[PDB]
Ligand binder design. Structure first.
Ligand code: HEM
Ligand SMILES: O=c1cc(-c2ccccc2)oc2c1ccc1ccccc12
Length: 477
């Protein structure tokens, strides 16, 4: 008594490739209106099941986590972390789970934990405060110079410096060339790794001239080399009872593992150590992208920049910088961050999943090994859940008093769910908050009338906007 998931008809050789088009999240949302929460398509010859709906997605990822925690064996994933990525490899067994645990401990220990150098505050707040100021300074230098800027160029360095501090104990000047070459120079990582990339489904596209994929390979080689340069320096300078950062903790773990008698061979030193890259990659890109959207939204909705400015002044004043502890007392800042997440849904699909065994979901049979997409954009824009999905309205998360409506904030899905949920979620929420709170308390961003500011997401794993050279900032009265 179990059926196959329904879905539309497809071309016999390419399936639904052309229907996905350039915006698969939009196409598949429409498609779920007709066929429901569990539907099936084909890209090339590969079946993919696509999921939507809060509860359906919770049912699969959480209630049946183990069934759906896999990753499909895609070509493009074989190019990340030298084919041995924690996050993207086909391994979702005990080696994976162990790597996952080390990354979580790494994170907690070097972000949320108390900075020794500060009684009051944690590492993360320490690094974000430092970089927030440098950033302010830097933007000034440009207003006093050309009078406008592309904010991304500068945000990306500031944000990279935070996660860089945590992973590698280093930071970089806003003009360092090697860094800019890493995180601001043909970073199409997200573009190629987005759900539905044809190259992962049409074998010939891999071997044809493909500027995208070559760029993607060069990017991965560079990131890998950078990790390696950095790991060598940490080894050379390792101090045995002084763990400076995550890379040190992974070196330590490798060391400890050398005096096990039956040391497990599959959790290699390489797989223990390259963890630091998956963190660094995820950490710089998604958070940079989030703040970049937040800015675009501020500059297109001055009404909201002001309301936030007002809440900061009222709740904290211009007597001191804001702090993590003020997060709980700044519910309009929360509403604005939530609505940035909802409206942009800049991570529209999770990284694709895979079934780890035969299973069933809402009466549908799903065989082991089936590639599964998980459509978060659909949840965040569902017309049955939200009033004007298409409008930027922070106020939708506020009660009549002006407190955050908890039940409604919990329907923003942008970090996944279940076994493969973002492990960066708390850092990401605190980092965006602090960066915004510290910035908006002291400056104002704007763009002039009469210039094009494209607000159209460009598809990928993280969805970017086109570069905007017209940002302006002014200190506050
Ligand atoms: C706004 C910020 C962020 C968003 C929206 C975000 C979102 C996500 C999403 C949607 C996933 C996919 C879940 C899945 O495949 O089921 C993911 C995975 C992941 N995130 Fe994030 N993330 C963010 C920030 C971070 C940061 C700061 C880090 C690390 C410092 C991080 C580390 C990861 C890692 C390692 C994974 C892979 C987990 C796994 O494969 O098992 N993320 N994140
Ligand atoms: O830009 C990236 C985003 C992301 C990312 C990762 C997880 C979730 C969302 C974005 O990852 C990477 C990126 C770049 C290089 C990477 C190298 C190894 C592993 C991950 C990398």
């Amino acid at each position: 008594g179990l059926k196959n998931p329904p879905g539309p008809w497809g071309w016999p050789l390419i399936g639904h490739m052309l229907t996905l088009g350039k915006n698969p999240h939009l196409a598949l949302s429409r498609m779920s209106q007709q066929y429901g929460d569990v539907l099936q398509i084909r890209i090339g010859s590969t079946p993919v099941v696509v999921l939507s709906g809060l509860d359906t997605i919770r049912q699969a990822l959480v209630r049946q986590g183990d069934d759906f925690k896999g990753r499909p064996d895609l070509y493009t994933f074989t190019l990340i972390s030298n084919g041995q990525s924690m996050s993207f490899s086909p391994d979702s067994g005990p080696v994976w789970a162990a790597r996952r645990r080390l990354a979580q401990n790494g994170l907690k220990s070097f972000s949320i934990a108390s900075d020794p150098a500060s009684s009051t505050s944690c590492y993360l707040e320490e690094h974000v405060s430092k970089e927030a100021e440098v950033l302010i300074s830097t933007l000034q230098e440009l207003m006093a110079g050309p009078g406008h800027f592309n904010p991304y160029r500068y945000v990306v360095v500031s944000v990279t410096n935070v996660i860089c501090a945590i992973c590698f104990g280093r930071r970089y000047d806003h003009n360092h060339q090697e860094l800019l070459s890493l995180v601001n120079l043909n970073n199409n990582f997200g573009e190629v790794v987005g759900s539905g990339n044809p190259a992962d489904f049409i074998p010939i596209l891999r071997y044809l001239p493909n500027p995208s994929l070559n760029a993607f390979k060069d990017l991965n080689e560079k990131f890998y080399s950078f990790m390696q340069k950095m790991v060598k320096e940490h080894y050379k300078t390792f101090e045995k009872g002084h763990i400076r950062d995550i890379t040190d903790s992974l070196i330590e773990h490798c060391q400890e593992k050398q005096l096990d008698e039956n040391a497990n061979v599959q959790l290699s030193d390489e797989k223990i150590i390259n963890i630091v890259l998956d963190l660094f990659g995820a950490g710089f890109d998604t958070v940079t992208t989030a703040i970049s959207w937040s800015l675009m939204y501020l500059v297109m909705n001055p009404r909201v920049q002001r309301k936030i400015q007002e809440e900061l002044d009222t709740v904290i004043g211009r007597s001191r910088r804001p702090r993590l502890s003020d997060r709980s007392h700044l519910p309009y800042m929360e509403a604005f961050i939530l609505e940035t997440f909802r409206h942009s849904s800049f991570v529209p699909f999770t990284i694709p999943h895979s079934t780890t065994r035969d299973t069933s979901l809402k009466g549908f049979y799903i065989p082991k090994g089936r590639c599964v997409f998980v459509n978060q954009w659909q949840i965040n824009h569902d017309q049955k859940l939200w009033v004007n999905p298409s409008e930027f309205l922070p106020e939708r998360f506020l009660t009549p008093d002006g407190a955050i409506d908890k039940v409604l904030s919990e329907k923003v899905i942008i970090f996944g769910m279940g076994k493969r949920k973002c492990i960066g979620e708390t850092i990401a929420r605190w980092e965006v908050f602090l960066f915004l709170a510290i910035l908006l308390q002291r400056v104002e961003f704007s763009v002039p009338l009469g210039v094009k500011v494209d607000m159209t997401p460009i598809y990928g794993l993280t969805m970017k906007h086109a570069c905007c050279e017209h940002f302006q900032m002014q200190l506050r009265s």
